[PDB]
């Protein structure tokens, strides 16, 4: 892992296999159609972030301070989501 920085609409539309991305600010995120396996985010922040479609597997969120985040279609549930601060977070749709 390498320390993450603050990216405006990162829209990292490529798939990741790295384990961790410790350090995150991610203001106005625009992630779309990214397939994480074995990926983790620790000590990360998300404001006005947007997830379109993530086929996440074995990936969990730790110490993530979501604020005003909409996920639309995702594989994220309490099972794949570790304890962390979430406010004004919405999960419109989910997949099996």
């Amino acid at each position, epitope marked *: 892992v390498f320390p993450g920085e603050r990216v405006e609409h990162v829209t990292f539309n490529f798939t990741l296999e790295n384990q961790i991305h410790r350090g995150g600010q991610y203001f106005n995120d625009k992630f779309i159609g990214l397939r994480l396996k074995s990926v983790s985010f620790e000590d990360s922040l998300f*404001e006005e*972030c947007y997830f379109e479609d993530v086929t996440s597997s074995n990936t969990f969120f730790r110490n993530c301070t979501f604020i005003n985040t*909409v996920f*639309y*279609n995702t594989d994220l549930f309490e099972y794949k989501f570790v304890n962390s601060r979430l406010i004004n977070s919405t999960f*419109l*749709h989910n997949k099996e």
Partner: nanobody
Framework: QVQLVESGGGLVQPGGSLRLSCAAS????????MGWYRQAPGEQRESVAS???????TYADSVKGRFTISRDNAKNTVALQMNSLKPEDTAVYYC?????????????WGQGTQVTVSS
């Protein structure tokens, strides 16, 4: 604030169909156009389906061969084509909009419309 429009409630027979059309106006900036949810007596809203962005869609597995979604962005509308309306599966149907503007994500909900089944 985006004004959303709800419609299409009432009695339909199994084998018949209804068009529940979502529409919205004001402050629309290439939005994810309203998808559909089913509200039961119990406090909860089941996902139905969405064709909100691009030409792609996700339908719930629970609505396979029952709820079909078609979208016309040039109009900011979504049409739910209700079919296979088995008598027990009634609900209040809701439009769920997502704002993709410069101030970040925002969402809107309508009051919903009640659909029942004729027999």
């Amino acid at each position: 604030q985006v004004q959303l429009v709800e419609s299409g409630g009432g009695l339909v027979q199994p084998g018949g169909s209804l068009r529940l059309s979502c529409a919205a106006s004001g402050s629309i900036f290439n939005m994810r156009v309203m998808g559909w949810y089913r509200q039961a007596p119990g406090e909860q809203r089941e996902s139905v389906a969405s064709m909100a962005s691009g030409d792609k869609t996700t339908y719930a597995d629970s609505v396979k061969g029952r709820f079909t979604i078609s979208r016309d962005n040039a109009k900011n509308t979504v049409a739910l084509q209700m079919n296979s309306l088995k008598p027990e599966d009634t609900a209040v149907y809701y439009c769920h909009a997502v704002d993709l503007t410069r101030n970040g994500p925002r969402v809107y909900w309508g009051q919903g419309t009640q659909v029942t089944v004729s027999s």
